[PDB]
Amino acid sequence: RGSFVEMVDNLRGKSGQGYYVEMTVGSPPQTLNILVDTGSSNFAVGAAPHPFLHRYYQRQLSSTYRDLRKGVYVPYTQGKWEGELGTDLVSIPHGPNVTVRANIAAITESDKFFINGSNWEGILGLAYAEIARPDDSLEPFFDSLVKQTHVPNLFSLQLCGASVGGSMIIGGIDHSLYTGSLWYTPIRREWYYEVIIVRVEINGQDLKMDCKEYNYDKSIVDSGTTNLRLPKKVFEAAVKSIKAASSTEKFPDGFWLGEQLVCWQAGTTPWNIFPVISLYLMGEVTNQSFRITILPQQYLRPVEDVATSQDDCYKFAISQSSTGTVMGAVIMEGFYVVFDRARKRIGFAVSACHVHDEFRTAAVEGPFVTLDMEDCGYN
């Protein structure tokens, strides 16, 4: 506990493409790069020669593969994948020295799922059984890992960003990955990693909305989403405030809606024109909260693949949502995040690797006095 040198820097990725960990499946071990995803609950891997894939799971080569004789069809809002369920032996080379028999969805058909040019071939769904497909009887990977081994029921994520890197500490916390203290928010319900936001500030200025709006219909912590996604009404108020605070320069309306990029000359991004964003999260104690604060370095994201521009272009990575608040990479890149499943709580601390400048730093601060925090949750 406390120090896990072998798991430090076990995450890789490229801008806009996610964070993946190396895993092995089957006997003899087949190496795959697997997207780390706290926003879903299936372990699902490419199993057929899709042209976008560097490699795929070849079940015929595994002596320990067991067929579950069941299919699964998983439609997303935009993409889809279809697979055949089975179990096999799974290990994480730069994780704990253990081997687990886990459920694997062998992906046999997909659409808009794999990314052309990405270096991952599967997704590790780290959330709970309640949102696993086809149903909650398909035990998620981490549940299998904890049941079958002596690995503690906790993992932590340091997502670094701006090619990317970071650490997934399985079964522990590594104190070198953060500064200051961890502050914990309760996991409201074990399905997604659901949390409650009690207050929102832009540059210290309160949005003054009914706090139910912040969590309509839920708020989640999701390593598998890029953006900070906010409920439509909250996004409207947030953008209005961000526009006002950033009034020194004017931008087209499309930029704020993520419909167009905005570009600047290299090394001349005016970060200081853009405001900080603070989310107050429900604390561990009645009437107690804490505040997490991100910078423009988190929410204005570089787009490097612009062939029609020589300048440095950025995507506004705060967007409107119909699925509630999503605390994606925009949030998580500022922080070391502890998914303390054993105690049904999520810890936040300032990330030792977060991108900042000489004037401002991402922050985790408390305690604050906040009343009626239970009323902020949507029912």
Ligand SMILES: C[C@H]1SC(N)=N[C@](C)(c2cc(NC(=O)c3cc4c(cn3)OCCO4)ccc2F)[C@H]1F
């Ligand atoms: C709808 C999503 S949300 C979801 N949570 N999981 C599913 C399993 C899903 C996710 C992804 N994610 C990414 O590609 C990606 C990219 C990032 C990034 C994070 N994630 O942060 C740094 C910048 O780039 C891709 C496919 C996919 F199916 C879906 F449920």
